[model samples]
Target: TPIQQLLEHFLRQLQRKDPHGFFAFPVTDAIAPGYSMIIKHPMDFGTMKDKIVANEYKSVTEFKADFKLMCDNAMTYNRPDTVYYKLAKKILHAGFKMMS
Candidate 1:
């Protein structure tokens, strides 16, 4: 549960700092225990660059919308329970609509 807790914590931290956007998932080199992984969403870089250039969207609502999209997408891949088949089903449910 520590990994999940840490993931959730980092997600929130990124959300707070970069409300306009954040990464959907964290990637690790391999499945190992006790390694700290911080996956940067490609969009995070673009958003930060945009912020630096335009200085836009300095509001909670705008940031929350971006956060929701990121979190919803994140759910597609990493559910706490279940394995291949179940996770695949969850992925379909979470990501299918977006694919269209």
Candidate 2:
């Protein structure tokens, strides 16, 4: 349960961070309730690089067209009771509502 909580906390942070296109996830080594663990990596981000994409998306309109359908497909498992399912719903709903 503790591990799940940590995972959810990190995921919520991801939702908060994604609007700026941050992708590197910060994962902590949580060994146990009382033991210490190492920070396995740095900020874990690699942003603002110089790379060109052919046929790049032209705008938010293009981005959303590619993004919105992902939400609809995420819950295909139909396990509404699980945190994984519920978090996906929250995130997907928020993205759609925000973009709209």
Candidate 3:
């Protein structure tokens, strides 16, 4: 429980700074005891008015880095085409141009 609690604290700090990056991960799981818990995104996630939020997802290089970390975190996962992996190459490729 201590570890999950600590993780929650850290996530809180992250969310305060970048609400967009904070919501990129819509869900999180607490590495707690046998209970095996999950975490929540920031409160302002969906209602944010920042037009620049996509900028956080814009850093194509950063997006690439997270892909590796995402796979590494999973012991083994479903096909990358699934929801967990954003398959829109253009999104990660061209960023804002890739948005709308």
Better of 2 and 3 by lDDT: 2
Ranking by lDDT: 2, 1, 3
Q: Could you tell me every candidate's TM-score relative to the true structure?
A: 0.31, 0.40, 0.25
- The order by descending TM-score is 2, 1, 3
Best by TM-score: 2
Per residue, candidate 1 scores C-alpha lDDT tens digits across 1-100 of 3233433443344544433332423333364222233333422334533443453545434443444444443444445463523433443444333322
lDDT of 1 at 18: 34
Worst 10 residues of 2 by lDDT: 44-53
Model 1: C-alpha RMSD to truth?
Answer: 12.7
- Model 3 pairs in collision: none
Clashes of each: 0, 0, 0
In candidate 2, what are the lDDT values of residues 10-93, reduced to their tens digit? 334445744543233332334122212322222322211111023243444544443443333334433678554565577666
